[PDB]
Every structure is written in C-alpha cells, then in structure tokens.
Ligand binder design. Sequence first.
Ligand code: HEM
Ligand code: HEM
Ligand code: HEM
Ligand code: HEM
Lengths: 146, 146, 141, 141
Amino acid sequence: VHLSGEEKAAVTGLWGKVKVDEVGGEALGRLLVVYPWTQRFFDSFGDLSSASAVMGNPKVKAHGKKVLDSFSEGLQHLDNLKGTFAKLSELHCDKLHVDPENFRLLGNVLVCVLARHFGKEFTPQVQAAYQKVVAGVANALAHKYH
Amino acid sequence: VHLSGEEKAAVTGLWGKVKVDEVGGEALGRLLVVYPWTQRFFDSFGDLSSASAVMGNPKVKAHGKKVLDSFSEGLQHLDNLKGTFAKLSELHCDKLHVDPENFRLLGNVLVCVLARHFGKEFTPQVQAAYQKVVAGVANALAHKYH
Amino acid sequence: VLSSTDKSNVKAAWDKVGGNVGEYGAEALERMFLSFPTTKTYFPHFDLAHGSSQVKAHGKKVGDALTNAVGHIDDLPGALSALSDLHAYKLRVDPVNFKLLSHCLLVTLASHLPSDFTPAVHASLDKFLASVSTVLTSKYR
Amino acid sequence: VLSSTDKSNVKAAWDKVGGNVGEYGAEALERMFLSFPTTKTYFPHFDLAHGSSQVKAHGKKVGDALTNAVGHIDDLPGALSALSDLHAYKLRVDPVNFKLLSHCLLVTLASHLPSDFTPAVHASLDKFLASVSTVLTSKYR
Ligand code: HEM
Ligand code: HEM
Ligand code: HEM
Ligand code: HEM
C-alpha cells in the first residue's frame, strides 16, 4: 500500500534516531521469549532455556542487527518491496521452512520495542505509519511461498 | 503453485461428481456454526442463533451455490488466478471488510464437506491436490488487500 | 495454562499500573482505531475523535474489567461469565480484533512503564490477555 | 469455555469411535504428512511410508491420550500435565502444526462417521481439540 507524504516523513524522522546496534537484538530476543516455539529455528545459537538465557545470548544479538539492516533497505524501496525481498523470500521458504505467521509476530514485537525506547514520542500517529511498513515487509517476504 | 499432471487429473475427476446445488450451501453453513463470529457478515439473511437455525436458512444455501461457481471458474484458470479473482478481491477488501484469515477457514470447511460426501474415495492423495487449490484461491482473494 | 509464576508476574505489573488503569484503557482504544481503521466499524454510534468523552468512559469500563480478572485469576471462566455472554452472543466480535486490542494494550504499557515491562513480564501478560480473549469469544451458557 | 453441552457432544462422538481410536490416529497422521510436507521435519527418525509400523504405533499413543482427555474433561490442565511438559519444553512444536493435525483428525472423523459428524458436534470437537492444543503448547511447571 501507499504511504502518504506525512506518513513517510514520520518514518524517516524516527528511524534516524534508532540505536542500530541495540533495537534489532532486543526485538529478536523478545520473539524467542514471548513465542517460545521460535527457539527451535535457532538451535545452533546455544542456551535458550529461560528468559535470562535468551536475553544474554551473543549470537541472538548479532543476528538481530542483520535483520534491522534488511528493514533499513526496505525503507528506501517502498514502491518495489517485492523485487527488493525476492531473494530472501526464496530462502525463508525453500531452505528455512518458516511459517509466514511468524513474520507478522516479529513485526509487532519490533513495534513494542520502538514503543519502549521512545515513550511519549511514539504517538498513535507514528505507530500507524510503522504498522503500514511492517505489514508491507511481511507480505513481501511471504510472496514466493505462493 | 503448480499442480502436477496427476494432481490436476484427481481434481477434475472428483469435481465432475459434485452435487452443485448441495455442497456449497453445507460449506457456508458449517462456517457459520463452527466459527460463530462469521454470522455478523450475513445479518440480512435472518435467524442464525442456533445450529438448527443456520442449517435450515434458505438464503445461506443460495449464496453457498454462488461461492461454489466461483471455485469452478478458478479451476479453469489455475495459472492465472490473480487476474481471474482481481475484481472479487477488491470487493471483499474495500466493501465487505472481511479479514483474510477467514478465506483459509472457508477452504478447510469445504475440504471437510468433500470428505463427508465422498468417504473412502477422498483419499490422502485426493485431499493433497485439493489443499493446493484452496490455498491458491485464498491467496488470490487476498492479493488486492496489500 | 497460566502458571503460578505467570500469576505472580501479572499481579506485579498491575501493582505498578496503580490508579492509572482507566487512562491506559482509553489510550489503547485510540491506538487501535487509528492504526487499524476497520475496527471503527464496531462503534458506529461513537464519536471517535481524540479526547472524546465516550472513549474516556469506555476505557474506564474495559480497565475495571481487567482488574477484576486479576483478582480472580484462579477461575477466569467463573469471573467473566457475564462479559463472555455479551461479546460472544450479542456483539459477535471477530477474534482478529482481540489480537489488535491486546497488541495496542502491550504498546501502551511498554510506552509508560519501560522499567517494569521486562521480556518475562511481557510473556506472562501476552498469555493473560490471550486467555481473557478466548473466554470472551467462547459460548458457554 | 467448554460448556456442559460441549462435554456431552464430545463424549457422544467418542462413544461412536468405539474400539477404533488407534486406526483413526494413524490415518490423521498420514493425511498430515502428504498434504503438508513441512510437518515431516519433526519426524526425521521415522519411516514415513504408507502402512509403516512406526506410524501405526504412534497413532495408537496419540489416540489413547485423547481418550484420557475425554475421561477427565472437567480438568484438562490436571490430566495433561506430563504431555504438555513434552510438547512445550522438549519438542518446541509451532502452534500452526497443531491446527494442521486437528484439521486432519476432523477430515478422518467426517470420512468414517458421516451420520454422527453433525454441524453442532463438528463445532464442539473443533473447540475440544483447540483446548487440548493450547494446553500442549503452554509452559506451566
Ligand atoms: C521481519 C522479517 C524478517 C527479515 C527481514 C529477515 C531477514 C533475514 C536475513 C537478512 C537473514 C540472513 C540471510 C543470509 O544469510 O543470506 C536471515 C536469516 C535467517 N532467518 Fe530471518 N528474517 C525475518 C523473519 C524471520 C523469522 C520470523 C524467523 C523464524 C521464526 C527467521 C528465521 C531465520 C533463520 C533461522 C535464519 C538463518 C540464521 C542462521 O543460521 O544464520 N527469520 N533473515
Ligand atoms: C472461498 C473464498 C470466497 C469466495 C470464492 C467468495 C465468493 C463470493 C462471490 C462470487 C460473491 C458475490 C459477488 C457479487 O455479488 O458481486 C460473494 C459475496 C459475499 N461474500 Fe464471499 N467469497 C469467499 C469468502 C468469503 C468469506 C470467508 C466471507 C465472510 C466471512 C465472505 C463474505 C461475503 C459477503 C458478506 C458477500 C455479500 C453477500 C450479500 O449480501 O449478497 N466471503 N462472495
Ligand atoms: C481485553 C478484551 C476486552 C475487554 C476486557 C472488554 C470489555 C468490555 C466491557 C467491560 C464492556 C462494557 C460492558 C457493560 O455494558 O457494562 C464492553 C463493551 C463493548 N465491547 Fe469490549 N472488551 C474487550 C474487547 C473488545 C474488542 C476487541 C472489541 C471490538 C473491536 C470490543 C467491542 C465492544 C463493543 C462494540 C462494546 C459496546 C460498547 C457500548 O456501547 O457500551 N470489545 N467491553
Ligand atoms: C492432539 C494433539 C497431539 C497429541 C494428543 C499428541 C500426543 C502425543 C503422545 C501421546 C506422544 C507420545 C508420548 C510418550 O512418549 O509416551 C507424542 C509424541 C510426539 N509428538 Fe505429539 N501429539 C499431538 C500433536 C503433535 C503435533 C502437531 C506434532 C508435530 C507436527 C507432534 C509431534 C510429536 C513428536 C515429534 C513426538 C515424539 C515421537 C516419538 O519419537 O515417540 N505432536 N505426542
């Protein structure tokens, strides 16, 4: 879907203030604690048996950064998300066997993390623009499953 | 996704034996009893307050037939489902406000109805081919939501 | 399904909410209406502008209902029997909408209580709201 | 959440299943593996060919567990505590897979019992399987 001129401005403004080395790791960690079955995809990362273990794991933090960088590329090609994510969609389907419902859950955890970091600045209006972005990314990652 | 030559043959064989005036009405009725919130979209159809009421309602039966006819057109254009369902996708999104999760539920209820009607003839192999068809239709109906 | 540990976590979060349950209820509703415009169709009889009196009053009702659930967390079907009657039999709300409101409640709590909203507490709260949601969309007269 | 009426319906269906619970368990598994090939990845240690001895044995275990649930339908968390430990803590099964197996169990019952599988009974069985699924994917030590 199309973002309006105002929605685009709000997204660009907040994203320039994000802690690039921090936000992605917290989002991936909360996915693994809140929705505990997601731990199975990351078995090679180590001990994930309690909330404290997941949130202290170095491999979880590093991969979270790579995920954030991918969101950042998406933000520069909002009218061609399918072409941008075509290769990654093939990977998550054909090789990793991730059910697409999990793409939606990760998007919403990211939104909860932006809320925790920005407080009063994460207004209903800023949240609304980000919901359009995370939905667009989820759909683009799912497109080669069909 | 592509159906194999064998999958296409199994779909064509069973569909020629379907009771056209019966199967669609039973599928729509079971949707309304098993998943009772779906009743809200059909308020103009009358009394839907108990299992017996839903399954005896004439407007539910008639609309179920129209749904079946749409599935029948889809079966003749399996490599161009998006173009075929483009108009209907716009309607269900822009005018009717139906959440796409419900398209999946209707597909699976239809499969349960085919099982009840065909018994031992609805083998694991026949079921597998029909799961590819109902997934393709659900995706095509959702495509203009994005 | 909710553990003894989950019950302790939920009660801890609610202690920190203090006297603010009504304010948080109203904010969660406002976030839902703007982000997900289709949810507005369940409230055609409301004025849905920011800071409306109708949204303030309703936010207080939703909040107070959640406080009663916490106080009776050992038997949720027993405590919520009347509210289930309303949401399941009369209003016929699609379960997808309960996911949207629950998410908006979590976003609100995260915004206001950043030091109390730990990953472990986030997990217990998501479970509690899912259990409440299931009770409210079930028919059990 | 399950009503008194739901409990009566589930017990009625199970009466009609009679001595065939193990056969229906195995058929439901076979339908799941063929229709939804990704589910095979939880059983890399099995021979998954039609009529295999391993699928027959496992079908009997799944079936017998459901019979115990019916007999203790007033307290499912109490009856299923050990099986939840296994599916939630050890196996870490994605909830989407419980939806696929439950659907395949309904397809199996519909195939074999067309006169007993009424819309009202279909509704009560879908609820019972959803409740069992929630218990098995929840952590409550
Ligand atoms: C927000 C949507 C997502 C984005 C943008 C994303 C992005 C990425 C990227 C860029 C990679 C590295 C690709 C490469 O090495 O070539 C990756 C790998 C991976 N992703 Fe995702 N991902 C998303 C959602 C998910 C979800 C929900 C799961 C599982 C529940 C998942 C599981 C994995 C796994 C297991 C790997 C491989 C990790 C490894 O072993 O190195 N992804 N993803
Ligand atoms: C299997 C996927 C579906 C197909 C192929 C389908 C097909 C159709 C067709 C052909 C029409 C008539 C279009 C017209 O009058 O121009 C229609 C109308 C309608 N559909 Fe669907 N539909 C599907 C799923 C659903 C679901 C899941 C719901 C709700 C939960 C729904 C709700 C409605 C409603 C409310 C109408 C208008 C009925 C009336 O008032 O006349 N549809 N659909
Ligand atoms: C945490 C979940 C929820 C709780 C605890 C809750 C609680 C309540 C309460 C306490 C009332 C007022 C009952 C009274 O008359 O005394 C109410 C009414 C209502 N609810 Fe909910 N609710 C929830 C979710 C939802 C959702 C997701 C929707 C739809 C998007 C919804 C739609 C409505 C509507 C339309 C009314 C009637 C409003 C009026 O005119 O008074 N509810 N709810
Ligand atoms: C109605 C829901 C289910 C029930 C009642 C059930 C029941 C059982 C039972 C009774 C066992 C054997 C326990 C023992 O060792 O004595 C078992 C094991 C197992 N289950 Fe389930 N199960 C269900 C759903 C699922 C699903 C959806 C999956 C994954 C797709 C799954 C995967 C497994 C696996 C991999 C084992 C270990 C098999 C072995 O090597 O023995 N289960 N289950």
